[PDB]
Structure 1
Amino acid sequence: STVPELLARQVTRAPDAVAVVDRDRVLTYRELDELAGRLSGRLIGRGVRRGDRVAVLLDRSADLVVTLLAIWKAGAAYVPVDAGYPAPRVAFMVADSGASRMVCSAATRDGVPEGIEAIVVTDEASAAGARPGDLAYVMYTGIPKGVAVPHRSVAELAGNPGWAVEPGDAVLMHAPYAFDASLFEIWVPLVSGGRVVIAEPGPVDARRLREAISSGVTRAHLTAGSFRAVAEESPESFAGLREVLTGGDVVPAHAVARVRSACPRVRIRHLYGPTETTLCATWHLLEPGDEIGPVLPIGRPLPGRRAQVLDASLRAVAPGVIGDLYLSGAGLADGYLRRAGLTAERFVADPSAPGARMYRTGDLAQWTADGALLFAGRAD
């Protein structure tokens, strides 16, 4: 599948449902589809062809969502560049990814590197169509590397039934689109019929979260750092959410327990996974009313994914034994752009699935007796 294919199902089912809320600008599903189609036509007319990489340098906004979908409709892959990156980093990402064009705004126009065609988004509809085996994006992740992710992997993530996002949900969007969390913030609600609520400029703090919840936001992801801070300082600020999500850096069980005792009814979801396997490969969900206990698991593989904990001989270890964690099944990136050797040493053959690959996380983990995973630190 592709995220555009899943999105088209929602546009057909409820074209006049709200898709994107940006301050006072509101886009319905049909309006978003039509705007992206027009921008796709512009991209095709400027010479974008299937498989091209198009850099994006924009502030979060409805125009950002339109732009990403338009690049996809043109058959191309987006290269997300955060407007706050230094110019040498931006130049590297554009050149290493092979992007010859960059979509920007009046405000960001000055950040387009020399020799790169600037497409100012504020300036006929035609679409080539996204395909599952084509690249969807290149996300950079201490030398920067480009992770090349196909449409099929993005759709496996965004359309996963475990997200449990419904048409009435409103998801707060504030993560950098350069980052993986953006996939949940933007594509999960849109393939589910819900809406994306673009956060006001600046970092989301406890007060802004409370205001977003009062305005109708039902789900929000916070980085581990921001979640720990709010959990310890103002855990009642999560009240009214259907679900809060967090992951990345370490989240201590104590932080989750603080939220549960302040907010008995909020679902708390811990996410784990690298950019190489599309946002998250395992997760742990704390249901309303349940208490976390002394350790926060990284949890169980998402539906459609698999995890293995192997020893130095590549044999599966028994529960309670720490070994090397490998991630497989759905959601793997194609590899590292322009770096086949590096790809071949980290996306390796999977002994448990014929012809398949598994991603070597470089993390250590152990299983519990009933099949959850506990983090046991990075191997280095």
Structure 2
Amino acid sequence: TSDPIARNSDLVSLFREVAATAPERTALSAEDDRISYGRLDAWSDAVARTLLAEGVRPGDRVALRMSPGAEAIVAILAILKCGAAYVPVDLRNPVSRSDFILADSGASALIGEPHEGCAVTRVVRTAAVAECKDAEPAPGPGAEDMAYVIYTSGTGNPKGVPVRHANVLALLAGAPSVFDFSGDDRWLLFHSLSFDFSVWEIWGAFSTGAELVVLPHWAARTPEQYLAVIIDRGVTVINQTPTAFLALTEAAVRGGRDVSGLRYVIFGGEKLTAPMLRPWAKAFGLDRPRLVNGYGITETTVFTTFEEITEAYLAQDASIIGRALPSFGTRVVGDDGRDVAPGETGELWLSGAQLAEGYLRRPELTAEKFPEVVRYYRTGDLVSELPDGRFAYEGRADLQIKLRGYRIELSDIETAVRRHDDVVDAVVTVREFKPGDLRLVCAYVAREGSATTARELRNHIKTLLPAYMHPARYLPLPGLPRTVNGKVDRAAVARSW
């Protein structure tokens, strides 16, 4: 086969082949600064040498604390080239979380800038990375070697998820069952390196020989700045949370921007419903760009299912995550003796080459979350199979509570609220009214350009749910509060009340 993705079994071999084949093509751009594949390959070989001198060796975990930029990408390639795995430290981590991640992962070196009080002293500064830029530049990693460790909160200790070269290659090989990508695409590098969305951004581009466009620091604050850059730089593929997409849509429409240069907008990370999509579709249609809902988890290498948005999607009030990539086996499992009857809601279980080995030094947890039956991962997500095989996403599986004589599925209440045409987000929690009087309450976000009263929402819910599942109060918020890992911050919401 001529296909580099099918032919290579690790990311370093893949990158090296893509680069060597057409080394003058642009791999990475930052403003007007264009870095060719050949240049990037040599640059990262040089930085790898610097890491070798710091004792970095195959199997090592090397911390990475940098904002998404050219140097950070060079650093990633260098770490991988040393046969090591990178451990991204979110710049906006509380100091305690960073301390734990470094300790837990046994990071033996850090590249970039150490957070204040950082315990790792073996440091390759960003400046040293830049120094290597235009210089001349070991077996390299194998398929079963770790490429990165990304930590996912849930509360408890953050769980380290080691993902192998083979895991990522499985994802990259699955992508073309859904997407038409080529070396002429330009991908925006946007997400924090500590979020696995960035793994998809980086390797989506590199695996296809495309250009990775860095969002400049000046453009990092507003959707207007974001749009200016993606349009100016001829970006064809962007990746967004549904939340970010709301802001993008509003800026595009109000600013009269031309978005038709985009080929794909790819969603991940949150429940996607039609009210979040209808305004973009109204202005821009669904062809240029194509919109694709992606569902995935750190533990199964970024993405698991995709659903390309269609007119049909816009005409229904639920959330559809679509069909699983070819590597996956799936089960929808009840409590019980497991498998549910088609159409019924249960926990999604996943199998296949995209599954991580398990958590880092968490034998207890791994055994539970990665059971054998064929090895599976229990997503902790509730879904239901549609008549045609696509999955609808219901909610998280740990949201049942006990209240006033009932077991209550908070996820079902949230889903019912999300069915309202003028709601784009919602969180249901329990709070105290009178002492000894606890009740369901719902914080929600109105569709831009709409205003829905508590009374109207109560009336909406009356048609869908029994009275014991009715929120007692509603609270409109500009947006829901979010963690840096977030995603909605379910705990901060309770505080907003």
**TM-score by shorter chain over 0.5:** yes
Query: Residues 62-103 of structure 1, C-alpha deviation per residue, up to 9 Å, x if partnerless?
Result: 111110010000010000012222322211111110002100
Aligned length: 371
2:54–2:109 contact (8 Å) kept in structure 1: no
Q: Is 1:210 paired with 2:215?
A: no
What's 1:69 paired with? 77
Q: Which structure would you say has the larger Rg?
A: 2
What's 1:367 paired with? 385
2:220–2:226 contact (8 Å) kept in structure 1: no
What's 1:158 paired with? 172
| 3-state SS of paired residue (1:63) | helix
Residues 2-41 of structure 1 mapped to structure 2, 5 A cutoff: 2-41=10-49
What's 2:188 paired with? 172
Q: Is 1:137 paired with 2:137?
A: no
Q: What's the C-alpha RMSD, in Å, of the aligned pairs?
A: 2.1
Distance 1:293 1:127 in 2: 56
* Structure 1 residue runs without a partner (length 5+): none
Q: Is 1:182 paired with 2:183?
A: no
Task: Evaluate the alpha carbon distance shift between residue 69 and residue 307 of structure 1 in structure 2; reply closer, same or farther with a 3 A threshold.
Answer: same
| 3-state SS of paired residue (1:357) | coil
Query: Residues 156-206 of structure 1, C-alpha deviation per residue, up to 9 Å, x if partnerless?
Result: 123432343211100111100100100121111101010100001153643
Query: Residues 112-144 of structure 1, C-alpha deviation per residue, up to 9 Å, x if partnerless?
Result: 713521111422988541111111111011131
Task: Evaluate the alpha carbon distance shift between residue 307 and residue 251 of structure 1 in structure 2; reply closer, same or farther with a 3 A threshold.
Answer: same
Distance 2:249 2:266 in 1: 12
What's 2:368 paired with? 345
The Cα shift of 1:255 comes to 1.6
What's 1:275 paired with? 298
What's 2:315 paired with? 293
Q: Among residues 69, 84, 87, which one is paired with 2:95 in the alignment? A: 87
Task: Evaluate the alpha carbon distance shift between residue 26 and residue 208 of structure 1 in structure 2; reply closer, same or farther with a 3 A threshold.
Answer: same
Q: Is 1:263 paired with 2:280?
A: no
1:18–1:194 contact (8 Å) kept in structure 2: yes
Q: Which 10-residue stretch deviates more, 204-213 or 38-47? A: 204-213
Distance 2:151 2:62 in 1: 14
Q: Is 1:303 paired with 2:326?
A: yes
The Cα shift of 1:233 comes to 6.0
The Cα shift of 1:305 comes to 1.6
Q: Tell me the percent identity.
A: 36
1:159–1:191 contact (8 Å) kept in structure 2: no
The Cα shift of 1:260 comes to 2.1
Q: Among residues 247, 250, 253, which one is paired with 2:274 in the alignment? A: 253
Distance 1:55 1:305 in 2: 30
The Cα shift of 1:259 comes to 1.9
Q: Is 1:148 paired with 2:165?
A: no
Q: Is 1:358 paired with 2:358?
A: no
Q: Among residues 46, 50, 72, which one is paired with 1:42 in the alignment? A: 50
Distance 2:221 2:48 in 1: 32
What's 2:127 paired with? 122
Distance 1:130 1:112 in 2: 32
Q: Is 1:200 paired with 2:219?
A: no
TM norm structure 1: 0.91
| 3-state SS of paired residue (1:254) | helix
Distance 1:169 1:61 in 2: 18
2:107–2:120 contact (8 Å) kept in structure 1: no
Q: Which 10-residue stretch deviates more, 272-281 or 7-16? A: 7-16
Query: Residues 304-360 of structure 1, C-alpha deviation per residue, up to 9 Å, x if partnerless?
Result: 2222112223443232111111112121111111111111100111x4xxxx32110
Q: Which 10-residue stretch deviates more, 203-212 or 127-136? A: 203-212
| 3-state SS of paired residue (1:93) | helix
TM norm structure 2: 0.71
* Counterpart residue identity of residue 153, structure 1: N
Q: Which 10-residue stretch deviates more, 289-298 or 318-327? A: 289-298
Distance 1:47 1:321 in 2: 53
Task: Evaluate the alpha carbon distance shift between residue 214 and residue 35 of structure 1 in structure 2; reply closer, same or farther with a 3 A threshold.
Answer: same
2:267–2:293 contact (8 Å) kept in structure 1: yes
Task: Evaluate the alpha carbon distance shift between residue 146 and residue 126 of structure 1 in structure 2; reply closer, same or farther with a 3 A threshold.
Answer: farther
* Counterpart residue identity of residue 95, structure 2: A
Distance 1:115 1:253 in 2: 46
The Cα shift of 1:224 comes to 2.2
Distance 1:15 1:233 in 2: 37
* Structure 2 residue runs without a partner (length 5+): 1-8, 129-134, 399-497
What's 1:284 paired with? 307
Task: Evaluate the alpha carbon distance shift between residue 376 and residue 22 of structure 1 in structure 2; reply closer, same or farther with a 3 A threshold.
Answer: same
2:42–2:137 contact (8 Å) kept in structure 1: no
Distance 1:96 1:378 in 2: 27
* Counterpart residue identity of residue 118, structure 1: V
Distance 1:125 1:43 in 2: 16
Distance 1:58 1:315 in 2: 44
Distance 1:21 1:126 in 2: 20
